[PDB]
């Protein structure tokens with residue numbers, strides 16, 4: 001059907017991953033990555049950089065696309081086509097805002113119970129830097145009715 005473009009950025013380093021507790025708005029009460037809608041006149045990668053900076057205060061040397069996930073929320077007018085980026089190359093410190101509190105998690109302490117339920121499926125691939133295409137059919141924000149996830153050579 002009709003779909004909208006989104007980006008999702010994970011700051012993933014050898015020993016730790018950066019997530020942000022949402023205090024308000026989309027994903028409130030969960031540890032989320034950084035992202036949002038891609039705008040007209042910017043590339044998907046430019047949009048990922050922009051959202052990372054707007055949300056966390058971070059600027060990076062480079063980012064790479066590691067996956068794509070299509071979300072179907074039952075009853076919503078459009079699909080969400082999310083392009084997933086990864087980067088280790090931060091140039092400063094994350095900053096807490098009125099919207100978000102940043103936290104570095106050790107890789108054996110990733111808080112899946114306090115994250116979106118789909119994350120449990122594709123994180124093991126992200127952590128191995130294995131590229132992936134996924135699809136998740138949701139009923140509301142807690143329930144996965146169906147999904148697919150495959151390792152790909154090209155996103």
Ligand SMILES: CNc1nc(OCCOC)nc2c1[nH]c(=O)n2Cc1ccccc1
Pocket residue numbers: 006007008027031032033034035036037071080082115116117118119
């Ligand atoms: C780290 N896992 C996840 N992080 C976010 O950060 C929000 C920034 O992206 C807009 N969102 C996640 C997320 N895992 C997850 O399911 N979502 C929900 C989502 C659904 C549809 C479009 C975008 C995000």
